[PDB]
Ligand SMILES: Cc1c(O)nc(CC(=O)O)c(C)c1OP(=O)(O)OC[C@H]1O[C@@H](n2cnc3c(=O)[nH]c(N)nc32)[C@H](O)[C@@H]1O
């Protein structure tokens with residue numbers, strides 16, 4: 131009878147083991163979700179990326195090309211991938227209604243900060259992680275930036291950098307802690323990550 135639509139553009143900066151799952155969740159959403167999905171990440175599928183290889187990605191393929199490839203010629207929503215790391219130099223790649231940061235490799239916070247500022251300057255809501263380490267059970271929680279635990283390293287850095295109205299998700303277990311990165315945890319983070327993206331997407335109206 132009365133039929134509803136995808137709206138908005140969502141950028142996912144980072145498309146590794148968590149970013150990929152967020153992409154998958156979003157691509158499967160029906161009667162809503164974003165109309166446009168942008169995935170940005172500079173890295174290739176290697177042997178260790180089982181989650182990609184089980185879906186049939188080849189070693190050597192950029193993660194964002196594999197993901198783009200799943201939106202085959204008849205697919206109704208747009209997925210475009212960009213196989214580049216975000217730097218101070220290519221912030222022109224950051225725009226949309228929601229921007230979601232799920233990156234890892236060294237210290238990611240400076241470039242993240244630059245991402246959240248540039249994106250909120252172009253009126254996008256912003257979201258990212260605060261620790262996705264865990265062995266399986268630990269809780270999945272959500273918080274705004276200015277209510278975040280100040281001992282939490284991410285929240286600390288972003289609050290000191292003067293960031294406001296920024297949504298964070300995580301177990302709160304970190305690089306520092308003993309816990310590794312487990313798939314059930316990345317699934318639950320991803321499920322929650324997606325839901326918070328959707329709230330913020332509705333906010334674009
Ligand atoms: C570090 C990390 C990872 O290995 N995997 C994933 C998922 C994936 O594979 O896609 C994410 C999201 C991730 O990032 P996380 O949310 O855990 O936090 C990243 C940032 O958070 C900071 N951070 C978090 N915990 C610590 C810590 O315990 N010590 C320090 N020095 N920095 C920390 C780091 O500087 C880093 O830039």
Ligand SMILES: Nc1ncnc2c1ncn2[C@@H]1O[C@H](COP(=O)(O)OP(=O)(O)OP(=O)(O)O)[C@@H](O)[C@H]1O
Pocket residue numbers: 143144145146147148149170171172173193214215216217232233234235236241
């Ligand atoms: N500056 C950046 N911009 C966009 N994506 C990034 C950036 N830095 C890291 N990433 C991506 O975030 C993802 C992190 O997830 P995961 O930990 O599974 O991957 P990774 O193999 O650790 O990658 P890396 O070797 O870059 O740390 C990676 O695919 C990585 O390419």
